[PDB]
Amino acid sequence: ATRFASVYAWNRKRISNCVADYSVLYNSASFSTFKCYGVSPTKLNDLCF
Amino acid sequence: TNVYADSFVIRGDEVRQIAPGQTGKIADYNYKLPDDFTGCVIAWNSNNL
């Protein structure tokens, strides 16, 4: 967005009460490493977090 | 028996994605690698041509 914090003072953000998606992650910037531990990226929109 | 070679050229940003059973821009809408399929995949860079 504009600027993020360091790792020792890790930046925390709270998100709820909205719709999330993974296919919308490939428009504003192309990512390099994307690993969802234990969860396949194709099913994330099919579960309700 | 019945060796078939499927040849093409792609960018390195999608080389790791071609695999039998995943999703993606190319793996879903350009070619379909079967899950029970048995074969080999070889990719090599070609800058000179």
Side-chain angles (χ1 to χ4, degrees), chain A residues 3-14:
Chain A
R3 172 228 44 85
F4 292 165
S6 291
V7 65
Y8 61 97
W10 52 279
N11 189 359
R12 181 161 172 80
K13 196 169 187 287
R14 173 81 189 90

Side-chain angles (χ1 to χ4, degrees), chain A residues 9 19 39 43 45 47:
Chain A
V19 57
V39 298
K43 72 183 183 181
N45 284 325
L47 294 174

Side-chain angles (χ1 to χ4, degrees), chain A residues 8-48:
Chain A
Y8 61 97
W10 52 279
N11 189 359
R12 181 161 172 80
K13 196 169 187 287
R14 173 81 189 90
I15 293 171
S16 63
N17 294 290
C18 52
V19 57
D21 191 1
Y22 44 72
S23 298
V24 300
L25 297 172
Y26 309 142
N27 55 2
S28 70
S30 292
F31 292 164
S32 66
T33 303
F34 164 72
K35 189 176 188 294
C36 298
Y37 293 99
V39 298
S40 67
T42 74
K43 72 183 183 181
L44 294 174
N45 284 325
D46 291 331
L47 294 174
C48 184

Side-chain angles (χ1 to χ4, degrees), chain A residues 26 32 41-42, chain B residues 16 22-23 25:
Chain A
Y26 309 142
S32 66
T42 74
Chain B
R16 67 171 179 83
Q22 290 77 16
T23 186
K25 278 74 69 177

